[PDB]
Amino acid sequence: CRLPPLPTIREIIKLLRLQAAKQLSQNFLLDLRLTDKIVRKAGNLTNAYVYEVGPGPGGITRSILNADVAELLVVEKDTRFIPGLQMLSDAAPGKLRIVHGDVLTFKVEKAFSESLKRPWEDDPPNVHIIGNLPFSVSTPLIIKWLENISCRDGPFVYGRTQMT
RNA sequence: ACAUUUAACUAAAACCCCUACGCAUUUAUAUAGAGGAGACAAGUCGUAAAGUGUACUGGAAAGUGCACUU
Ligand SMILES: [Mg+2]
């Protein structure tokens, strides 16, 4: 797959219409080797439904796409990155579903098909979650998803979904 | 534990005890499994008020609390 080039920091600064490098208020992992490492540690994703959060520039997104994922659902809150994610989607037809929304409220139990929903006592249900979010958002999210596991609802309606 | 016999008109003969050491003790090797250090990985890799210590941290790219230094 011929994916478009990864944005540089100058291109990111222009994209946020910020015109400077000091007021980013955000840190980007623009090194594809570390993102490749992270996706490797996420497990074998060949033909796996991956729900990715906090894409931003899209290093994790490109790394996941390079793995033979079946469908990749992406949720982005900043609309300014949606153009880049859209070009990335055009590069990979039918393997990227972008959604503009907030991960603390987005409802994943309806995103993927119902044929995926495996029992709790069987193996994890081929659905993986990967995320590099702001640290101010990852802890409410993990608390919320722990509550979901305790209730066996939300992303864990499919079974014992693994998170990275 | 165990015990002085014969013999002695030259002088000699005889002698023979019974008790472990083991699921004890020392060190070493082999084996399941787990954990460390080394090579700043080399590129046909990518690019352009502050500080120190300590305590909590569940909206932690660091914050707040206390004490310090310039
Ligand atoms: Mg706090």
| A162 CA to centre of ligand 1 in angstroms | 28
Structure token pair of residue A151? 């209730």
Resolution of the experimental model, in Å, one decimal:
2.5
Write the burial class of residue A41 (CB in 10 Å: 0-12 exposed, 13-18 middle, 19+ buried).
Answer: exposed
Alpha helices in A16-101 (DSSP H): 32-41, 59-66, 82-91
For residue A94, how far is its CA from the centre of ligand 1 (angstroms)?
Answer: 42
Tokens 């994943």 found at: A108
Query: How was this entry determined?
Result: cryo-EM
Tell whether A77 is in a known binding site: yes
Scored b (16 or more CB within 10 A) or e, A61-79 reads bbbbbbbebebbbbbbbee
Query: For chain A, how many helices (H) and strands (E)?
Result: 5, 5
- Sketch out chain A's domains with CATH numbers: 9-164 (3.40.50.150)
CA A39 to C1' B33, in angstroms, rounded, equals 28
Cα–Cα dist A140/A143, whole Å: 5
Report the C-alpha gap between A141 and A134 in whole angstroms. Answer: 11
Task: Give the pair of three-digit tokens for residue A109.
Answer: 């139990």
Stated as kind and residue range, the H or E segment containing A11 is helix A9-15
The reply to whether A75 has its C-beta less than 7 Å from any atom of strand B is no
Residues A97 and A131: beta-carbon distance below 8 Å: no
Does the annotation place A3 within a ligand binding site?
A: no
What DSSP designation does A102 have? -
Chain centroid to Cα A100, Å, comes to 12
CB atoms closer than 10 angstroms to residue A84:
21
Task: Dump the DSSP string for A136-158.
Answer: HHHHHHHHHHHHHHHHT-GGGGS
A9 touches strand B (CB under 7 A): yes
Give the other-Cβ count within 10 Å of A146's Cβ: 10
d(CA A11, C1' B68) / Å: 43
Q: Which two tokens stand for residue A129?
A: 């979650």
Q: Which residue lies nearest B62, CA-to-C1' measured? A: A135
Q: At a CB cut-off of 8 Å and minimum separation 6, what does A154 contact?
A: A107, A108, A109, A144, A145, A148
Residue A45 Rama label (left phi>0; alpha psi -120 to 50; beta):
alpha
Instruction: Report which DSSP code applies to A3.
Output: P
- CB A159 within 8 Å of CB A119: yes
Question: A103 among the known binding-site residues?
Answer: yes
Which nucleotide lies at the shortest CA–C1' distance from A6? B46
For the stretch A69-76, contacts whose Cβ atoms lie closer than 8 Å and that sit 24 or more positions apart, written own/partner, are: A69/A45, A69/A95, A70/A95, A71/A95, A71/A97, A71/A112, A72/A96, A72/A97, A73/A49, A73/A97, A73/A99, A73/A111, A73/A112, A74/A98, A74/A99, A75/A51, A75/A99, A75/A100, A75/A101, A75/A102, A75/A103, A75/A106, A76/A100, A76/A101
How far apart (Å, rounded) are the C-alpha atoms in residues A54 and A31? 16
